[PDB]
Design a protein around this ligand. Structure first.
Ligand SMILES: CC(=O)c1ccc(O)c(C)c1
Lengths: 18, 335
């Protein structure tokens, strides 16, 4: 599932601007 | 018609004669760090003479220079002192010392949208439409003053005591007539034109609204991956997938907001924002009651008291050291 992929991804924490 | 007319007259006067040096560090009691990042942190403080609590953003001038954010920083404070809108966080004071820049803002104890969205998983469409409406009104206000916001994300939206949104972080906000080119923002939220360096305008903010709305209703962004380059490839590729629980109207809105075609991206066409405001997905929204804060919030934060910070994460505290020599004084002269 996309949700499961997200949760296991390295981007679910606060995201820094570039 | 144009409430914006009045709006703009008040902004322009503050814009040309911006407030400066309106407090000093010793007038505040430092309580706890509410958030941190690139050029400095945000602290809960207490105004000694009134007992009011505030959020104080501290930027190390040396770090701002190192990151080439001087102009952006002057933009941030000049604009934030000049604006006024129900869903825009208020700047109460600003000042600077030998080492840092300080922006003393309204304390919004309900924490970040980011925190509650990740915790709860995803929002209900009505719940997400309540927030979105607030951002649609804010963007039409900002864009009417020729401002681009450029940093929309749940991390930057705070939830107040009434369950309404307060937009923070004007670090990339810019008064610009026409188009601009800076590569800035957050990878998940960038519009195609930014990634492709085509030069861009306020349309980028309407795309970002597309990402936010999707993220809120689905619980994850429309474009994600473990590294930013992959995220750019996805955004640039003209393709979006939607959860099967998204209602038809919402997919249609999002298809028009996450529109790689500027000529067709919603809010960017002949009808402007009324293209968004008039959309069927917003069918049940009283835009006026939303502004006047007369709608009932879906969610109301719990705070066991004043200065209470359970809605914010814990951050390692660091001391605020002030040098004995003035740093980068000429660069931040107008702050
Ligand atoms: C992070 C930021 O800019 C911020 C601004 C106002 C505020 O009340 C809080 C809690 C944070």
């Amino acid at each position: 599932t996309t949700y499961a992929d997200f949760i296991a991804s390295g981007r679910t924490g606060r995201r820094n601007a570039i | 018609k144009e409430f914006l007319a009045k709006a703009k007259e008040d902004f322009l006067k503050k814009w040309e004669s911006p407030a400066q040096n309106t407090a000093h560090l010793d007038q505040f009691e430092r309580i706890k760090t509410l958030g941190t990042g690139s050029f400095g942190r945000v602290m809960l403080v207490k105004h000694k003479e009134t007992g009011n609590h505030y959020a104080m953003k501290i930027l190390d001038k040396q770090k701002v220079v190192k990151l080439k954010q001087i102009e952006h920083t002057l933009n941030e404070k000049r604009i934030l002192q000049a604006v006024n809108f129900p869903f825009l966080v208020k700047l109460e004071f600003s000042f600077k010392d030998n080492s840092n820049l300080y922006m003393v803002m309204e304390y919004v104890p309900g924490g970040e949208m980011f925190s509650h969205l990740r915790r709860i998983g995803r929002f209900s469409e009505p719940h997400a439409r309540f927030y979105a409406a607030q951002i649609v009104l804010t963007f039409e206000y900002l864009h009417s003053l020729d401002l681009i916001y450029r940093d929309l994300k749940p991390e930057n939206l705070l939830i107040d005591q009434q369950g309404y949104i307060q937009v923070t972080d004007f670090g990339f906000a810019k008064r610009v007539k026409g188009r601009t080119w800076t590569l800035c923002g957050t990878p998940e939220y960038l519009a195609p034109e930014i990634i492709l360096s085509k030069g861009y305008n306020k349309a980028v903010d309407w795309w970002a609204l597309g990402v936010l709305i999707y993220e809120m209703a689905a619980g994850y962004p429309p474009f994600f991956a473990d590294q930013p380059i992959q995220i750019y490839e996805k955004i640039v590729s003209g393709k979006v997938r939607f959860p099967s629980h998204f209602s038809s109207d919402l997919k249609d809105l999002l298809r028009n907001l996450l529109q790689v075609d500027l000529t067709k991206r919603f809010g960017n066409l002949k009808n402007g924002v009324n293209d968004i405001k008039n959309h069927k997905w917003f069918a049940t929204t009283d835009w006026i009651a939303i502004y006047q804060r007369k709608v009932e919030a879906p969610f109301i934060p719990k705070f066991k008291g004043p200065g209470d910070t359970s809605n914010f994460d814990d951050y390692e505290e660091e001391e605020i050291r002030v040098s004995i020599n003035e740093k980068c004084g000429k660069e931040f002269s107008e702050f």
